[PDB]
Design a protein around this ligand. Sequence first.
Ligand code: MG
Ligand code: MG
Ligand code: MG
Ligand code: MG
Ligand code: MG
Ligand code: MG
Ligand code: MG
Ligand code: MG
Ligand code: MG
Ligand code: MG
Ligand code: MG
Ligand code: MG
Ligand code: MG
Ligand code: MG
Ligand code: MG
Ligand code: MG
Ligand code: MG
Ligand code: MG
Ligand code: MG
Ligand code: MG
Ligand code: MG
Ligand code: MG
Ligand code: ZN
Lengths: 122, 206, 53, 112, 122
Amino acid sequence: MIQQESRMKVADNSGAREVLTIKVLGGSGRKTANIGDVVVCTVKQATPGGVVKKGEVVKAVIVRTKSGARRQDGSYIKFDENACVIIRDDKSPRGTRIFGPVARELRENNFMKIVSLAPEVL
Amino acid sequence: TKGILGRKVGMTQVFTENGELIPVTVIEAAQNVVLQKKTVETDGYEAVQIGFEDKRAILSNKPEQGHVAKANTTPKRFIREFRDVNLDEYEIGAEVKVDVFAEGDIIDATGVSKGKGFQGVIKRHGQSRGPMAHGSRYHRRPGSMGPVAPNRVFKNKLLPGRMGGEQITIQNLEIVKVDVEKNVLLVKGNVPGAKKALVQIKTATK
Amino acid sequence: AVPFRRTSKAKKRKRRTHVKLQLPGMNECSNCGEYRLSHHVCPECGQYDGKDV
Amino acid sequence: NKLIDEITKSQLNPDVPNFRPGDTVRVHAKVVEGTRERIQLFEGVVIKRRGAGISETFTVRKISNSVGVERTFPVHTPRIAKLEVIRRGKVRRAKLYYLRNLRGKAARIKEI
Amino acid sequence: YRKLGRTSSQRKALLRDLATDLIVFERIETTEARAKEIRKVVEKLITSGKKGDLHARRQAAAFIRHEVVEVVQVKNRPVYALQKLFDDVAPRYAERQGGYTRILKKGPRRGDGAPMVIIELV
RNA sequence: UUGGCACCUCGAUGUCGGCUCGUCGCAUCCUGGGGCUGUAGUCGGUCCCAAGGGUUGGGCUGUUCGCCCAUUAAAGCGGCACGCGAGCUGGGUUCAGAACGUCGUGAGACAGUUCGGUCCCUAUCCGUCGCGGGCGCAGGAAAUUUGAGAGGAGCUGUCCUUAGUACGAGAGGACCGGGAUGGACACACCGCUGGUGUACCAGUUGUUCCGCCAGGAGCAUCGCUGGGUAGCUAUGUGUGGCAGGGAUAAACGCUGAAAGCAUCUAAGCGUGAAGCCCCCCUCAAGAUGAGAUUUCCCAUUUCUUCGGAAAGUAAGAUCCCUGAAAGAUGAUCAGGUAGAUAGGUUUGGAGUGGAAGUGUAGCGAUACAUGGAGCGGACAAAUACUAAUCGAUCGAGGACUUAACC
Ligand SMILES: [Mg+2]
Ligand SMILES: [Mg+2]
Ligand SMILES: [Mg+2]
Ligand SMILES: [Mg+2]
Ligand SMILES: [Mg+2]
Ligand SMILES: [Mg+2]
Ligand SMILES: [Mg+2]
Ligand SMILES: [Mg+2]
Ligand SMILES: [Mg+2]
Ligand SMILES: [Mg+2]
Ligand SMILES: [Mg+2]
Ligand SMILES: [Mg+2]
Ligand SMILES: [Mg+2]
Ligand SMILES: [Mg+2]
Ligand SMILES: [Mg+2]
Ligand SMILES: [Mg+2]
Ligand SMILES: [Mg+2]
Ligand SMILES: [Mg+2]
Ligand SMILES: [Mg+2]
Ligand SMILES: [Mg+2]
Ligand SMILES: [Mg+2]
Ligand SMILES: [Mg+2]
Ligand SMILES: [Zn+2]
């Protein structure tokens, strides 16, 4: 449950360490974004010598949240921290590796490329 | 187009064959009896009058006892009409069992919403609070009553007032399970009312 | 904030149509032979109707 | 209620073992993706167990790849093939929310 | 349950005071709202009495006030409200399943019109 | 809008911007329909019809405005005392302090700057939102209702497929239709996920008390901390908008004369919008035009000039009492021994998490056992133990005329 000014750990190789959510895409007065939703965001902390630089405006897909997600089987999944992965125009990651566990909901929103790289998909 | 009266027992959940988990309202509809058939000749419109749960004799009056007599039944707590139904189906004094509905059937639940009492415009009309800090003395207030020129307030300036206890119709609720021996319908999702509320289940107009 | 016009006698009297007391709910006793509030103990007999206390 | 108990009694899973919060369980969760059906184990400590009857849920917490993941199931879901209690836990309360606020070496539950 | 125009501690103090008075005097004159709360609290104390265990004695002793009822004379030992609840009052409702109190309506009080009731045991 | 005028208000019409709440116009920003196009296609342009709904989060500026970031189907323009200060703010403006620049011999001044700088009012009437009492409605009642009329609702994206088809030299690339899935908004509800939960459970500090120990109680924000039932709840869940019909707008036509032809028009047909009227939801017979159906009670007594009056009643309702699913109060609904209405009691349940006492081990802090124990507001069922005793009060006897049939 991520809104404008929410910060997120970046879970990939792409230099970026922390992003700040500029906009939740996909609707006029859309306030909140959940796992699998794309956001526009600016890179606030950056690993020196990376692909993506501090103060750059990029698209990221939210891959885990503290709010988590309700499955249709009645089960839920929550995580300890909010992480996104920086993507391109097409839903493909700028980084080459994804860190930490990723939610299955990515396998439903056409983010197969990311689910492929995740060490554990819960 | 079928219909039946029941009491909301409460909510719970059931696992579908698929394996999915859905929330359900349980509606107990024992003791539905057809009391009266209204025709275009006699009353001016077609309807069937259905009486629901049995009421102790001392809680009924002679006018009531004399109206159920025609259907050879004890007096009933609730009596409602159903329009848009085939009067050929339904005989005076017949039971109306929940088997009139199957699984997958799509119904419209009508009932009275829970009473909230005197409420303000934030809860009753979903208005915005004024600021809580920065020196504000304007929190849960209804906003300008309108412009100066009319020298009056327009109708439908929404204000505080008694909030719930209104007739509400939720449309397109799937029936999930029908249990005749217990006279129970499981409707997917929730219907208006407190537990024990009268709920009117008719086939969906749409 | 303040009355624009004084309220007339007729208008004041109409407002008070409802400002009034209701008669007490009371009946005569059997023992006492005197009046009492229903569902209260009768202090003339010094008991609850005929039931001694 | 009593009628809601009678209606739901058939849906109750009798196989479900006896676990308390603090026990390390291994949930054999069915993962339904299209038509193919796959089994995915989730082993962690039972953090909470709330509700009555068919509405009972429990929450298993594991630390996966350094990130905490909580997984809440209905106790009587048919999408749990099997629930194994791996180790009984000596805890002193019903909800182990305190296991969210500290990392390694201070979260190892005392084993009986 | 009734807030009796008191905070939580004041109310708990008032219910302890009235309960003990009802156990000590077997008949008290109080307001209707007070009397409708007391009947709950006193009938639970009488239940603990009938239980008769040390545990039950210690539940009642956590609520009942430490008031001397009387001084009997054996060396004159005083008898406390708690002893009168386990030795005198409870055992006289040994074959009565509940309903140890009765509220009689008396009439309104001169000073504030408060509806007054007699609440008594049996 | 910039102005002109000085007609209301100087025994006060007291304020720019923002906030809250909107409502109206259409000169339409989006969405709908159409004509023309420098309309091949795509993407556009322009005009006509169209006001149903919709029409955003930030940074900078006191700023309206503007500029910018990022979105969106779109980020419309206006009116309403530049809408709305007895609704709010008080940043700007607008007072006494002070300083800078500037002008002045000076006191001072400047619609240059700068820092600081009291926001009053218990709602009488109308109005608005809710909620009762009265009477009316040609007998009195209890239910069930029709719907004159009113309110609400009315939005829209992306993806896949048709199809790399139609079109085109290529580049590119559809209409129409079919499917899936969203955003915003709305209604309901608490099973789920969470929130709260001050008479629920536990841990714990200080100090006072319960004579002492053990066990408890008071106070310290509910002392603090960890949980949490009922209820109430959103960020949670369910559902909705739709489709459809009728008549139309702009527009396209058909048939067709005046005017042997032509002509959408004069007669006459048809097609045709998110709009209009239905459809959907809610209120609704004070609809005084007071409607309908079913059922109940019956035509009493006394005097009275006929008129009518008075009195006890019927069916029925109330007072009073127990209450909650209802509630400011009235009201509503559940009950009043023809009894489960509340409390208690018994058995459960949630919740807490292992009571006290005793024993065992340990030097001890403590641990283990007895024993998922003890406790357990509001939840469930049973139970007449307590209280809903007893009474009383109100409430018909049905006008006349005419017509068809009694
Ligand atoms: Mg209520
Ligand atoms: Mg706001
Ligand atoms: Mg305030
Ligand atoms: Mg006017
Ligand atoms: Mg205190
Ligand atoms: Mg002049
Ligand atoms: Mg004046
Ligand atoms: Mg126009
Ligand atoms: Mg600004
Ligand atoms: Mg203005
Ligand atoms: Mg202002
Ligand atoms: Mg004014
Ligand atoms: Mg000078
Ligand atoms: Mg200033
Ligand atoms: Mg007034
Ligand atoms: Mg009218
Ligand atoms: Mg909930
Ligand atoms: Mg202490
Ligand atoms: Mg001690
Ligand atoms: Mg002190
Ligand atoms: Mg022609
Ligand atoms: Mg047509
Ligand atoms: Zn008497």
